[PDB]
Design an enzyme around this catalytic site. Structure first.
Site, PDB file in Angstrom:
ATOM      1  N   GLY A 205      36.548  27.914  49.328  1.00  0.00           N
ATOM      2  CA  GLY A 205      36.101  28.992  50.199  1.00  0.00           C
ATOM      3  C   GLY A 205      35.255  30.008  49.456  1.00  0.00           C
TER       4      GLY A 205
ATOM      5  N   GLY B 266      32.636  36.766  46.264  1.00  0.00           N
ATOM      6  CA  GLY B 266      33.705  36.014  45.619  1.00  0.00           C
ATOM      7  C   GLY B 266      33.924  34.614  46.154  1.00  0.00           C
ATOM      8  N   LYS B 267      34.713  33.836  45.414  1.00  0.00           N
ATOM      9  CA  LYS B 267      35.035  32.454  45.772  1.00  0.00           C
ATOM     10  C   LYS B 267      36.389  31.982  45.240  1.00  0.00           C
ATOM     11  CE  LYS B 267      32.108  30.431  42.098  1.00  0.00           C
ATOM     12  NZ  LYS B 267      30.910  29.587  41.830  1.00  0.00           N
ATOM     13  N   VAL B 268      36.931  30.941  45.877  1.00  0.00           N
ATOM     14  CA  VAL B 268      38.153  30.261  45.459  1.00  0.00           C
ATOM     15  C   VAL B 268      37.785  28.790  45.192  1.00  0.00           C
ATOM     16  CG1 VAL B 268      40.469  29.443  46.105  1.00  0.00           C
ATOM     17  CG2 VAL B 268      39.889  31.864  46.399  1.00  0.00           C
TER      18      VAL B 268
ATOM     19  N   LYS C  11      40.560  32.125  41.724  1.00  0.00           N
ATOM     20  CA  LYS C  11      39.746  33.140  42.395  1.00  0.00           C
ATOM     21  C   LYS C  11      38.874  33.832  41.341  1.00  0.00           C
ATOM     22  CE  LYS C  11      40.946  35.731  46.149  1.00  0.00           C
ATOM     23  NZ  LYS C  11      41.599  36.854  46.872  1.00  0.00           N
TER      24      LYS C  11
ATOM     25  N   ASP D 114      45.714  42.835  56.351  1.00  0.00           N
ATOM     26  CA  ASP D 114      44.967  41.751  57.021  1.00  0.00           C
ATOM     27  C   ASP D 114      45.851  40.529  57.320  1.00  0.00           C
ATOM     28  OD1 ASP D 114      42.771  40.418  58.266  1.00  0.00           O
ATOM     29  OD2 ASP D 114      41.634  40.122  56.400  1.00  0.00           O
TER      30      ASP D 114
ATOM     31  N   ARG E 244      44.926  32.954  59.534  1.00  0.00           N
ATOM     32  CA  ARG E 244      43.888  32.585  58.550  1.00  0.00           C
ATOM     33  C   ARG E 244      44.295  33.017  57.113  1.00  0.00           C
ATOM     34  NH1 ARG E 244      41.869  36.765  61.806  1.00  0.00           N
ATOM     35  NH2 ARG E 244      41.931  38.738  60.644  1.00  0.00           N
ATOM     36  N   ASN E 245      45.267  33.956  56.989  1.00  0.00           N
ATOM     37  CA  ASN E 245      45.768  34.466  55.689  1.00  0.00           C
ATOM     38  C   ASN E 245      47.203  33.979  55.367  1.00  0.00           C
ATOM     39  OD1 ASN E 245      43.554  35.833  54.400  1.00  0.00           O
ATOM     40  ND2 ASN E 245      43.866  37.640  55.607  1.00  0.00           N
TER      41      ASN E 245
ATOM     42  N   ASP F  61      45.915  36.387  50.672  1.00  0.00           N
ATOM     43  CA  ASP F  61      44.811  37.250  51.079  1.00  0.00           C
ATOM     44  C   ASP F  61      43.532  36.676  50.465  1.00  0.00           C
ATOM     45  OD1 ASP F  61      43.191  39.313  52.114  1.00  0.00           O
ATOM     46  OD2 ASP F  61      44.186  40.936  51.019  1.00  0.00           O
TER      47      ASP F  61
HETATM   48  C1  LIG Z   1      43.414  22.517  50.686  1.00  0.00           C
HETATM   49  O1  LIG Z   1      42.717  23.722  51.004  1.00  0.00           O
HETATM   50  C2  LIG Z   1      43.071  24.867  50.338  1.00  0.00           C
HETATM   51  C3  LIG Z   1      44.113  24.978  49.457  1.00  0.00           C
HETATM   52  C4  LIG Z   1      44.391  26.211  48.821  1.00  0.00           C
HETATM   53  N1  LIG Z   1      45.434  26.263  47.930  1.00  0.00           N
HETATM   54  C5  LIG Z   1      45.636  27.454  47.371  1.00  0.00           C
HETATM   55  N2  LIG Z   1      44.949  28.592  47.557  1.00  0.00           N
HETATM   56  C6  LIG Z   1      43.924  28.538  48.400  1.00  0.00           C
HETATM   57  O2  LIG Z   1      43.103  29.625  48.551  1.00  0.00           O
HETATM   58  C7  LIG Z   1      43.417  30.894  48.059  1.00  0.00           C
HETATM   59  C8  LIG Z   1      43.706  31.914  48.956  1.00  0.00           C
HETATM   60  C9  LIG Z   1      44.046  33.170  48.479  1.00  0.00           C
HETATM   61  C10 LIG Z   1      44.139  33.403  47.106  1.00  0.00           C
HETATM   62  N3  LIG Z   1      44.569  34.653  46.594  1.00  0.00           N
HETATM   63  C11 LIG Z   1      45.581  35.419  47.065  1.00  0.00           C
HETATM   64  O3  LIG Z   1      46.153  35.224  48.136  1.00  0.00           O
HETATM   65  C12 LIG Z   1      46.002  36.551  46.142  1.00  0.00           C
HETATM   66  N4  LIG Z   1      46.730  37.588  46.858  1.00  0.00           N
HETATM   67  C13 LIG Z   1      47.965  37.550  47.383  1.00  0.00           C
HETATM   68  C14 LIG Z   1      48.134  38.762  47.976  1.00  0.00           C
HETATM   69  C15 LIG Z   1      49.313  39.361  48.729  1.00  0.00           C
HETATM   70  C16 LIG Z   1      50.257  39.982  47.727  1.00  0.00           C
HETATM   71  C17 LIG Z   1      50.005  38.398  49.674  1.00  0.00           C
HETATM   72  N5  LIG Z   1      47.020  39.501  47.751  1.00  0.00           N
HETATM   73  N6  LIG Z   1      46.151  38.775  47.088  1.00  0.00           N
HETATM   74  C18 LIG Z   1      43.881  32.363  46.220  1.00  0.00           C
HETATM   75  C19 LIG Z   1      43.497  31.120  46.691  1.00  0.00           C
HETATM   76  C20 LIG Z   1      43.552  27.324  49.074  1.00  0.00           C
HETATM   77  C21 LIG Z   1      42.488  27.188  50.007  1.00  0.00           C
HETATM   78  C22 LIG Z   1      42.262  25.995  50.634  1.00  0.00           C
HETATM   79  O4  LIG Z   1      41.267  25.760  51.545  1.00  0.00           O
HETATM   80  C23 LIG Z   1      40.507  26.877  52.013  1.00  0.00           C
END
Ligand SMILES: COc1cc2ncnc(Oc3ccc(NC(=O)Cn4cc(C(C)C)nn4)cc3)c2cc1OC
Length: 298
Positions: A29, A34-36, A56, A159, A163-164, A177
């Protein structure tokens, strides 16, 4: 911010991981700054075995505000510690280049897309892995437990939505998030309001009109998340655009009717989450106690 200043929270150096031990794969994403990405981490396991993780990071398009925001997210994750209902921190790279935040990989992705994919085969009452009413009650319980934990640590999400929420093994949900890794400019669930792009359909009236975010405003968002869940991924306030008429109707007390698959006791929770008086809404702890009773009775 809200109750605690995330910039003042400490970062435990026990999380430090060497960045040369990460092998980057596909982008999961991306947003404007930013990106993951999916990655393989070597030496994270005590026994020389490789492991799949989510990383991230910021894009070269990011400014000083976004660089401070990624460091503040890392401080909050280190402060919270691990919890079964929240995405867990595995490590971080804070020297020798840009900040990298390493979290657990969730094989089924976001809950919103999972519900939409499973919508047509839903069963209200085996190899096929059909979505059932038993699974929707468990998801609602796990999300309330994770939110009860965040509130106990004086954290406001701001948020909360399907989706979160991420889904991993054994129908386990994890609150997350995406933040800067979501393209909010091209997502119709975010609306232009002043100089910001906000998720108005999930926001409490005090957050919309006064920019006030509290434990009680997160409870309002949870009620909206319940409607998404028991409607199997439908968008809230169907057929109603976010305009002057929308803000007027919400202030005047208009509320959504129950979604098609919501049990009456789950709609009773939604109604209380949407009370105009924040002091009349239940706490996340009260919601957990309520759902627990429903699951046991089932
Ligand atoms: C198979 O597809 C996926 C698998 C995935 N596996 C794992 N992570 C995925 O994305 C991420 C999403 C978010 C984050 N970061 C945070 O939530 C950090 N945080 C937490 C909080 C609060 C304290 C609750 N505030 N900030 C890091 C990675 C995936 C996305 C996928 O597809 C789109």
């Amino acid at each position: 911010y809200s109750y605690i200043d995330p910039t003042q929270l400490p970062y435990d150096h026990k999380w430090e991981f060497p960045r040369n031990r990460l092998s980057f794969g596909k982008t999961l994403g991306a947003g404007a700054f930013g990106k993951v990405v999916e990655a393989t981490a070597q030496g994270l396991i005590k026994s020389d075995a490789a492991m799949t993780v989510a990383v991230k990071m910021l894009k070269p398009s990011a400014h000083s505000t976004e660089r401070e925001a990624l460091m503040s997210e890392l401080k909050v994750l280190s402060y919270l510690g691990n919890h079964e209902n929240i995405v867990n921190l595995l490590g971080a790279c804070t020297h020798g280049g840009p900040t990298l935040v390493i979290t657990e990989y969730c094989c089924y992705g976001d809950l919103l897309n999972f519900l939409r994919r499973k919508r047509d085969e839903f069963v209200p009452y085996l190899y096929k892995d059909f979505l059932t009413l038993e699974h929707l009650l468990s998801f609602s319980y796990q999300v309330a437990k994770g939110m009860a934990f965040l509130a106990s640590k004086n954290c406001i999400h701001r948020d909360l939505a399907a989706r979160n929420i991420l889904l991993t093994h054994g129908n386990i949900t994890k609150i997350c998030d995406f933040g800067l890794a979501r393209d909010i400019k091209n997502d119709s669930n975010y609306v232009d309001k002043g100089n910001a792009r906000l998720p108005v359909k999930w926001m409490a009236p005090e957050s919309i009109f006064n920019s006030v975010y509290t434990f009680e405003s997160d409870v309002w968002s949870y009620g909206i998340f319940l409607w998404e869940l028991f409607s199997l991924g439908s968008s809230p306030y169907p057929g109603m655009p976010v305009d002057s008429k929308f803000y007027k109707m919400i202030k005047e007390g208009f509320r959504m009717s129950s979604p098609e698959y919501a049990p009456a006791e789950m709609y009773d929770i939604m109604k209380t989450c949407w009370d105009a008086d924040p002091d009349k809404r239940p706490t996340f702890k009260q919601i957990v106690q309520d759902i627990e009773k429903q699951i046991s009775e089932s």
